[PDB]
């Protein structure tokens with residue numbers, strides 16, 4: 001019996017790769033016609049999948065970039081227990097595998113990363129693991145940072161039952177655009193389950209690792225952040241601008257905006273799209 005997605009579609013029918021753990025990841029490509037100027041991997045966030053970057057990805061392909069992506073393990077059309085991972089580094093390992101593959105097939109080309117939220121944390125750790133290799137990083141409200149005993153309490157019963165959950169990601173604080181909160185609450189590829197303690201700990205490892213990595217980054221980046229984000233605190237973006245050694249770093253703050261700036265009120269989203277577009281054009285031209 002052919003291996004199937006968690007939505008029972010056979011992987012022989014979809015673009016895919018197999019990770020070091022023997023798991024199938026669903027892959028997604030937007031290739032320009034004629035020869036590409038650069039490569040860019042798009043790294044999605046927690047609960048979501050590659051499909052949510054359709055718009056951004058089409059805009060990047062339109063600047064003649066080869067845009068590729070995959071669903072992280074335990075997300076989207078990829079394999080694994082939903083929103084669980086053996087160590088956060090699996091995600092980074094899997095991005096590097098996909099990047100190394102794409103580079104083999106398009107040698108010469110600069111490679112960029114775009115990440116949102118958890119996908120931004122993965123973007124940072126990926127660049128930090130191959131210092132000097134990435135041409136640029138586009139970070140949309142990356143996970144860079146919530147109490148002390150809830151931290152200490154987690155790893156206590158991470159031994160007992162780590163399959164206990166806290167609340168789901170609260171969808172009302174995702175975007176002031178209610179159409180996009182509706183779309184989020186409707187997408188059958190989005191896992192809206194509670195946050196498992198075991199996943200909660202990996203997210204804490206990620207935060208911890210990202211903070212140790214910040215002082216070591218040199219990669220150019222564009223950092224977009226909402227001031228009223230209840231999921232990834234604005235202070236994290238300020239901290240990344242403080243600690244990164246990158247000679248080429250830009251912060252744009254969207255006053256009042258929630259977490260998902262690429263799916264916000266259209267004044268914000270159109271700005272987000274325009275800024276990413278200008279910043280990538282200037283660095284591929």
Ligand SMILES: O=C1CC[C@@H](CCC(=O)N2CCC(COc3ccc(F)cc3Cl)CC2)N1
Nearest residue numbers: 045046048117118143145200203204231260
């Ligand atoms: O378009 C979209 C749809 C989905 C959204 C992205 C969501 C995403 O990736 N999140 C948001 C929640 C954040 C929770 O963080 C923690 C939770 C518990 C914990 F114990 C320690 C941490 Cl650090 C992690 C990252 N954007």
Ligand SMILES: [Cl-]
Nearest residue numbers: 088089092125
């Ligand atoms: Cl890691």
